[PDB]
Structure 1
Amino acid sequence: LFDRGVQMLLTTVGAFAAFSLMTIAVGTDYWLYSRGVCKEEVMTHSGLWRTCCLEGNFKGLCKQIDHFPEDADYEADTAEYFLRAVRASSIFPILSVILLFMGGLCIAASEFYKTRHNIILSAGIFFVSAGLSNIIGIIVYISANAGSYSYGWSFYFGALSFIIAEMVGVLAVHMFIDRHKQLRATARA
Structure 2
Amino acid sequence: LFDRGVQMLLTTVGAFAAFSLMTIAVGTDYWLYSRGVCKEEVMTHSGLWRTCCLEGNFKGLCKQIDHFPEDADYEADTAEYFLRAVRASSIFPILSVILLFMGGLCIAASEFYKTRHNIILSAGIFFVSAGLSNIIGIIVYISANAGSYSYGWSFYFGALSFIIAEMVGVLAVHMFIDRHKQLRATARA
| TM-score over 0.5 for the pair | yes
Q: What residue ranges of structure 2 are gaps of 5+ in the alignment?
A: none
| Superimposed CA distance per residue, residues 16-57 of structure 1 (whole angstroms, 9 cap, x where no aligned partner) | 000000000000000000001111000000000001111111
Distance in 2, matches of 1:89 and 1:133, equals: 14
| Superimposed CA distance per residue, residues 75-94 of structure 1 (whole angstroms, 9 cap, x where no aligned partner) | 11000000000000000000
Moved over 3 A (4+): none
Q: CA deviation at 1:180?
A: 0.4
Distance in 1, matches of 2:35 and 2:185, equals: 63
Aligned to 1:118: 118
| Superimposed CA distance per residue, residues 59-79 of structure 1 (whole angstroms, 9 cap, x where no aligned partner) | 111110000000101111000
Q: What residue ranges of structure 1 are gaps of 5+ in the alignment?
A: none
| Superimposed CA distance per residue, residues 87-145 of structure 1 (whole angstroms, 9 cap, x where no aligned partner) | 00000000000000000000000000000000000000000000000000000000000
- Answer yes or no: is 1:179 the counterpart of 2:175: no
Distance in 1, matches of 2:31 and 2:179, equals: 41
Identity of aligned residues (%): 100
TM-score (norm 2): 0.99
Distance in 2, matches of 1:45 and 1:3, equals: 45
Q: CA deviation at 1:58?
A: 0.9
SS of 1:66's partner is coil
Aligned to 2:22: 22
Larger mean CA deviation between 143-152 and 51-60 belongs to: 51-60
Aligned to 1:150: 150
SS of 1:34's partner is strand
Distance in 1, matches of 2:86 and 2:113, equals: 39
Larger mean CA deviation between 56-65 and 11-20 belongs to: 56-65
Distance in 1, matches of 2:158 and 2:52, equals: 20
SS of 1:33's partner is strand
| Corresponding pairs, count | 189
- Answer yes or no: is 1:94 the counterpart of 2:91: no
SS of 1:150's partner is strand
Distance in 2, matches of 1:62 and 1:127, equals: 33
| Superimposed CA distance per residue, residues 122-171 of structure 1 (whole angstroms, 9 cap, x where no aligned partner) | 00000000000000000000000001000000010000000001100000
Distance in 2, matches of 1:80 and 1:55, equals: 32
Distance in 1, matches of 2:176 and 2:86, equals: 35
